[PDB]
């Protein structure tokens, strides 16, 4: 009944296309939620897509100026993976920052809403509010924007409070059936940890997070589920995964400290280890969220000064718009598969022919077989779409 | 299988955000029902949201003059909590006055419709009409407009028939599987009882109602399930919960009688006791249904002179529009949690920019943990919304 994730990691030679919602394309005719910060999380039967709605549809007067991340009307929308966020979509909680879990018995939703100085994180398990916690740093309390991990009924969530470049307090919360049973502060060599892409690595949980002040290498949070001990580091690959970043020739990583290379901003991304190698995804553009590529770096999880790419895949063409990406794990017959989603942001602050900001997603799953090439962009033409 | 609500009440330090439907904001683009008088009730698995529809969507020629309370086209809509009342919403009965019950086995719906002076109350259990009763005072027969409470298969509903400005005939109906097994005339010191917010206080049921005749203090109805005994009083707290009312300096309560302080009108509200203290919600504005606050009055359930407030939360900002509010109880793992909803009325007779009257809902649930501040209003811009 409680998911433990004790199976090994599936052998991955790459990723195969899994899902695509065409949300913006369907918005032109039809009522589709305005969403951002999506993620995918699966119960032991089927996968679900989540997103932070803006309390409006796209062909709506209220979709004007929907670029802001924190409004009182943002709610966590939840459909089956594949079903676009139509008007029948269930918004499961109030949140401008969210994280969702299925422990094998019920869904856990971590939902943060309220004032910036005074934010509340509500913990909803099996459809009921079981616990709530207030901001500890009295700043913008934020969480992963992706799936959290549960092992033996204990779910772990990374929550950050403070400024993304000033002092920020990151805590790991251990939640059992919606109740916060333990809270451990972040310890280790990583300092700015945000929007962690966490995945189960039995007997623990490993998170690859986003650094917003100093590093273009991604921080790593290792969580021992038994002892509740936290270890922090960075990804060792010389090909860093954060945007902005430096070229592949001029970039560097340290993987015990930030690389201090164009690290003053970031984007949510993912990476997972394959022995000494690392599978990672990033934008093709080093400065903007344009395009998306995945590849495997040889000894990129253990040795810095490694820039040996292999098995590169283009998920989104370099000319097309990408956004947040994250990892989610699907239990298989005999192993744990790693899958990822890419958020395809369309709209304001980069495309000024419309007044709204929204996204679609494309989902890829790890495969042991063969695959071809392609590109799966959003595909909506904003010049003809309602403004 | 039958719900007995035998668990104690959960320790409540306040309330955390639970749900927000954004109905009016989604109405601007998309087909959303025009509703009023909503409430929340939960089966042992999920929470559902109910509302009295007006037989029309908002972007509709029939949304004109939806400020009328009783029309032949009003039906009780029933969706999962979070799913907005879209066109796929099920209307479970014809009703301009409603109350819904889940006894642990099936849903009970008490639906009142027909002529104002010859109204019919239908009792629908497990999708069947089991019983029916006619208005006994030949005036507007009305009911709680919130969830009713079932203990051990016996559901109790409070029904009133009579005048809103004078003495009315209030009856308590004991219903078993849709069948009225007993009808008790209201007994006690409460003089006018209307729109009761009832919660299970095992072994009985406690209802906090509105006095529309002569009091701004809320009447209490105590119902013994085992004995079918009825006891009536008033919420003793000097900080009265009804609207209209006097200011916090001049408000008073008698704890046995109406306070005769701006008691000629009222709004549906809620209150529950925590030992000698009372947790109550009310509009921030004394005369209008603007804003919503929840707080705890120290010794407010026993002392008619206590005005000691604590644990105040702002649910809806002072300048924003509130409406009906009511209580609903959720069984947890070890106790019974108290949750409340607030109706966010928008439209006519207060906002003349539109021809329709409708509402949104925001839901909060009791919590033993910590929480911050915030405000969650309807948020629709009626100047740009279709009329």
């Amino acid at each position: 009944e409680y998911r433990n994730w004790s199976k090994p990691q599936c052998g991955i030679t790459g990723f195969a296309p899994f899902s695509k919602d065409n949300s913006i394309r369907l918005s032109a005719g039809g009522d589709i939620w305005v969403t951002r910060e999506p993620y995918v999380s699966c119960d032991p039967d089927k996968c679900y897509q989540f997103a932070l709605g803006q309390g409006t549809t796209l062909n709506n007067v209220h979709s004007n100026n929907t670029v802001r991340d924190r409004t009182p009307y943002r709610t966590l929308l939840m459909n089956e993976l594949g079903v676009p966020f139509h008007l029948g979509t269930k918004q499961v909680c109030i949140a401008w920052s969210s994280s969702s879990c299925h422990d094998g018995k019920a869904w856990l939703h971590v939902c943060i809403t309220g004032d910036d100085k005074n934010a509340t994180a509500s913990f909803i398990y099996n459809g009921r509010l079981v616990d709530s916690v207030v901001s500890w740093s009295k700043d913008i309390l934020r969480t992963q924007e992706s799936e959290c991990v549960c092992i033996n009924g204990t779910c772990t969530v990374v929550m950050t409070d403070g400024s993304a470049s000033g002092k920020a307090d990151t805590k790991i919360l251990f939640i059992e059936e919606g109740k916060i049973v333990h809270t451990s502060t972040l310890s280790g060599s990583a300092q700015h940890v945000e929007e962690c892409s966490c995945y189960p690595r039995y007997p623990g949980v490993r998170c690859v997070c986003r650094d917003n002040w100093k590093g273009s290498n991604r921080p790593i949070v290792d969580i021992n589920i038994k002892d509740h001990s936290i270890v922090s580091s960075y990804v060792c690959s010389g090909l860093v995964g954060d945007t902005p970043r430096k070229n592949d020739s001029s970039s560097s990583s340290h993987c015990l400290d930030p690389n201090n290379e164009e690290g003053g901003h970031g984007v949510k991304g993912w990476a997972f280890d394959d022995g000494n190698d690392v599978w990672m995804g990033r934008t093709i553009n080093e400065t903007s969220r344009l395009g998306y590529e995945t590849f495997k770096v040889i000894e990129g999880w253990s040795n810095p000064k490694s820039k040996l790419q292999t098995n590169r895949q283009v998920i989104v063409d370099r000319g097309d718009r990408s956004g947040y990406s994250g990892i989610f794990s699907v239990e298989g017959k005999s192993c744990i598969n790693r899958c990822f989603y890419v958020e395809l942001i369309r709209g304001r602050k980069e495309e000024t022919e419309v007044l709204w900001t929204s996204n679609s997603i494309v989902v890829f799953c790890g495969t042991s077989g063969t695959y071809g090439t392609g590109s799966w962009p959003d595909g909506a033409d904003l010049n003809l779409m309602p403004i | 299988e039958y719900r007995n609500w035998s668990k104690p009440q959960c320790g409540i330090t306040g309330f955390a955000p639970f749900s927000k439907d954004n109905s009016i904001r989604l109405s601007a683009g998309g087909d959303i029902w025009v509703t009023r008088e909503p409430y929340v009730s939960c089966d042992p698995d999920k929470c559902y949201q109910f509302a009295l529809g007006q037989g029309t969507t908002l972007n509709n020629v029939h949304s004109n003059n939806t400020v009328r309370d009783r029309t032949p086209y009003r039906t009780l809509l029933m969706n999962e909590l979070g799913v907005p009342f879209h066109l796929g919403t099920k209307q479970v009965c014809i009703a301009w006055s409603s109350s819904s019950c889940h006894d642990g086995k099936a849903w009970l719906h008490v639906c009142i419709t027909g002529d104002d002076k010859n109204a019919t109350a239908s009792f629908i259990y497990n999708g069947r009409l089991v019983d029916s009763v006619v208005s006994w005072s030949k005036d507007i027969l009305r009911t709680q407009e919130s969830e009713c409470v079932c203990i051990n298969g016996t559901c109790t509903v409070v029904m009133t028939d009579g005048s809103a400005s004078g003495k009315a005939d209030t009856k308590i109906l004991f219903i078993e599987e849709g069948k009225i097994v007993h009808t008790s005339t209201l007994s006690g010191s409460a003089q006018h009882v209307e729109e009761c917010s009832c919660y299970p206080r095992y072994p009985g049921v406690r209802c906090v109602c509105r006095d529309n005749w002569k009091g701004s203090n809320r009447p209490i109805v105590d119902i013994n399930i085992k004995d079918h005994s009825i006891v009536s009083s008033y919420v003793c707290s000097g900080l009265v919960g009804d609207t209209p009312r006097k200011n916090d300096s001049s408000s008073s309560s008698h704890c046995l009688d109406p306070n005769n302080e701006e008691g000629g009108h009222g709004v549906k509200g809620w209150a529950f006791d925590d030992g000698n203290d009372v947790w109550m919600g009310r509009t921030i504005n004394e005369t209008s249904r603007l804003g919503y606050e929840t707080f705890k009055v120290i010794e407010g359930w026993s002392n008619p002179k206590s005005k000691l407030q604590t644990n105040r939360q702002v649910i809806v900002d002072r300048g924003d529009r509130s409406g009906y509010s009511g209580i609903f109880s959720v069984e947890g793992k070890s106790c019974i949690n108290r949750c409340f909803y607030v109706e966010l009325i928008r439209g006519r007779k207060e906002e003349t920019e539109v021809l329709w009257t409708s509402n949104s809902i925001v839901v909060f649930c009791g919590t033993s943990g910590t929480y911050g501040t915030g405000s969650w209003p309807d948020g629709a811009d009626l100047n740009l919304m279709p009329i």
Partner: antibody
Amino acid sequence: EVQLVESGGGLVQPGGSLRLSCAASGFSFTTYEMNWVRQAPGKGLEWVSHISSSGLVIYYADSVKGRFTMSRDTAKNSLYLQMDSLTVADTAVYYCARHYFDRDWGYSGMDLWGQGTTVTVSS
Amino acid sequence: EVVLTQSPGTLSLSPGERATLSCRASQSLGTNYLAWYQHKPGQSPRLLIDGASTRAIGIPDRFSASGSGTDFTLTVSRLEPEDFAVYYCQHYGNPYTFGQGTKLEIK
């Protein structure tokens, strides 16, 4: 619709005190950064002070540091600039400006401005 | 200690030419936290360009801006009698600083 209205400007004696107030109409102070910007007569815009949506004062102009106190009260949705020991280099039109900090995108430009209030320090 | 230097001063054109407004930073900003404002006399300053490249909501399509590093440019493609005002470039990253401004005159 959103609006910013300042008040409290007027003649002040050099070495005196004045409290400027700016009120918000449509939006909420709990999610926006707020700023004070002054324009000296015959000079360009100067950023006086900046307060976060969390209530912390990130920035003070070097000239006004130690003399100007900027605060807010989210209950009344009002912004305050307590000016102390005013000199002749403080007479200017004072603007309360609003910009946003995005969790994802960081800071944005100051898109909402008030009408402006005039402070005159003479003799 | 960035010093936002607006290269053109008291520039004069005609209703329909192209305006080239320059803003030079003493040192590399390190981010896109460069904004342009329009300040007509007797009116509140109006945000035109945010992020050194993004036009604000409701700003006419004529206003466009570009640049990075130290040099940032604002260009009005076709002048109109409304577009004659004082233009400021602001660095809303650390350290906060405004530009001295540049005014458009009628010829």
